[PDB]
């Protein structure tokens, strides 16, 4: 029995085997078989958050197998972004975001609809009242797995 | 029988059973079997709003199985958004809208065909007359189903 390899938190998995003639399948989530999940060759484990094992068991013309086996594996939570400490402009100034962290994507959100996808974000420039809140950051890393999120206050001085 | 995860409400979901030759299938809406809804080996039930079950008969060769069957299970409405409550501006000064919710991507809509897809929407400058209105929002859930919808009014003073 085969899985599709590591998968990320609350994603989904194929699982596969051989093609047996005159076969049926049965799935098992545990190793008492007491639970079947699945009659296809090669069905789909939906939103998996740790890792996780299922059974197969194949009869032919009657005969059932010993059932077989696979673990998906669940990529670990990749770590918070290095966001800077709350800071203070004051208005007509500069607001400069930055993360010290590296990832395959970032995506950073915040007051104005601020938005953008780099390390080094546009800067604010004539910072004005509108501009404090918080901006929050969570990155993306190498396999696609999403980070937790981080947060900088800004303030804004009249 | 299986079905193919929770829906949202007014969703649509596929159901799934095993192949088996020389069968025929008749998928029956109540636990009777007195109302046939398909013959197909994967049927589709459409427009689900709440928690479904079908019934599947499996007829080889002359002779039918007992009644297999399976729930279709619908995920909850997603809770009303945190709106703020009614406001006043000025003429000339802003109109700052927010919500204080977390979603998987936000809905607002408003008077001048005022839009946008963030909890922390542009900011209104300069606001006048033609601003005042009802701003309405909905919100996705993680798993794509929508909230029901809240509102704040925003008067404009001359």
Redesign the interface.
């Known amino acids: 029995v085969f899985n599709d390899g590591p998968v990320c938190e609350g994603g989904n998995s194929n699982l596969s085997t051989a093609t047996v003639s005159g076969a ?1 399948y049965a799935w098992y989530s545990d190793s008492s078989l007491t639970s079947l999940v ?2 296809a060759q090669n069905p789909m484990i ?2 998996i958050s740790t890792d996780t094992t299922w059974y197969l068991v194949v009869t032919v013309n009657g005969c059932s197998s010993v059932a077989g086996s696979t673990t998906v594996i669940v990529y670990p939570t990749p770590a918070t972004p290095n966001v800077p400490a709350n800071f203070a402009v004051c208005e007509g100034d500069n607001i400069t975001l930055s993360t010290s962290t590296v990832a395959s994507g970032y995506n950073w ?7 953008s996808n780099v390390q080094n974000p546009v800067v604010i420039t004539n910072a004005t009242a ?1 501009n404090a ?1 918080v901006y929050t950051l969570s990155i993306v890393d190498g396999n696609g797995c999403e980070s937790g999120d981080t947060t900088v206050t800004v303030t804004v001085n009249g």
Do not use: E, H, L, Q
């Open positions: 049926s699945s009659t939906v939103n959100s915040g007051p104005n609809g601020f938005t509108s809140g």
